[PDB]
Amino acid sequence: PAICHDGKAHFPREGVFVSNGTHWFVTQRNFYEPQIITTDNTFVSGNCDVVIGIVNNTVYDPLQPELDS
Amino acid sequence: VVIGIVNNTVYDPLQPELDS
Amino acid sequence: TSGWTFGAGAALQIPFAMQMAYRFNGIGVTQNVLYENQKLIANQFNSAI
Numbered sequence: 101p102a103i104c105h106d107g108k109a110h111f112p113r114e115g116v117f118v119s120n121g122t123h124w125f126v127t128q129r130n131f132y133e134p135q136i137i138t139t140d141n142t143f144v145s146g147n148c149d150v151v152i153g154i155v156n157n158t159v160y161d162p163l164q165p166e167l168d169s
Numbered sequence: 170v171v172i173g174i175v176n177n178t179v180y181d182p183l184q185p186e187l188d189s
Numbered sequence: 190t191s192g193w194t195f196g197a198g199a200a201l202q203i204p205f206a207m208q209m210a211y212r213f214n215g216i217g218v219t220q221n222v223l224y225e226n227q228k229l230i231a232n233q234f235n236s237a238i
């Protein structure tokens with residue numbers, strides 16, 4: 101259902117969370133097209149312990165991978 | 170241009186993160 | 190077991206919680222509205238039946 105980043109539950113804006121067995125991705129429902137999980141394609145809401153089905157996983161932050169000027 | 174404006178602050182979460 | 194994917198093509202399985210989450214997303218309420226209170230929704234559906 102969602103990805104648990106550091107204490108916060110991340111749901112997908114559009115698409116579903118899927119995994120190849122090792123890594124987790126966001127993909128549109130009607131066509132398999134993996135995307136790295138980011139704060140752009142997933143919206144945070146609630147807490148990590150309110151929804152059943154949580155899977156702990158990192159959520160990439162595209163705002164400052166390299167932009168740490 | 171729009172009827173019914175209410176003055177209020179709209180936050181930018183970019184700048185608290187952007188310390189450097 | 191598959192929502193409406195079986196009406197378009199081959200039945201594609203999906204957890205029923207996620208199916209109802211998308212069906213909530215189809216009426217204008219975000220997915221988390223169901224997940225944060227999934228038990229309440231399930232109890233309401235069972236009581237209605």
Ligand SMILES: *[C@@H]1O[C@H](CO)[C@@H](O)[C@H](O)[C@H]1NC(C)=O
Nearest residue numbers: 119120121122123124125134
């Ligand atoms: C899953 O995808 C990731 C990223 O492409 C890759 O590094 C990993 O090896 C893949 N694992 C499998 C089981 O294919």
Ligand SMILES: *[C@@H]1O[C@H](CO)[C@@H](O)[C@H](O)[C@H]1NC(C)=O
Nearest residue numbers: 101151152153154155204206
């Ligand atoms: C899914 O079912 C398995 C076996 O019935 C159970 O161990 C697991 O906790 C369940 N997970 C969820 C998300 O309901």
Ligand SMILES: *[C@@H]1O[C@H](CO)[C@@H](O)[C@H](O)[C@H]1NC(C)=O
Nearest residue numbers: 104107148153154155156157
């Ligand atoms: C996720 O991490 C928290 C804190 O370490 C832990 O309590 C929880 O059981 C973990 N959940 C999973 C899905 O491993």
Ligand SMILES: *[C@@H]1O[C@H](CO)[C@@H](O)[C@H](O)[C@H]1NC(C)=O
Nearest residue numbers: 170171172173174175176177
């Ligand atoms: C609503 O009408 C009042 C007068 O009754 C007016 O002062 C106000 O600007 C109006 N607000 C909106 C949202 O149109």
Ligand SMILES: *[C@@H]1O[C@H](CO)[C@@H](O)[C@H](O)[C@H]1NC(C)=O
Nearest residue numbers: 171172173174175176177178
């Ligand atoms: C908002 O502030 C401007 C001045 O910056 C003022 O002209 C305007 O009337 C104010 N509107 C409201 C809703 O108070």
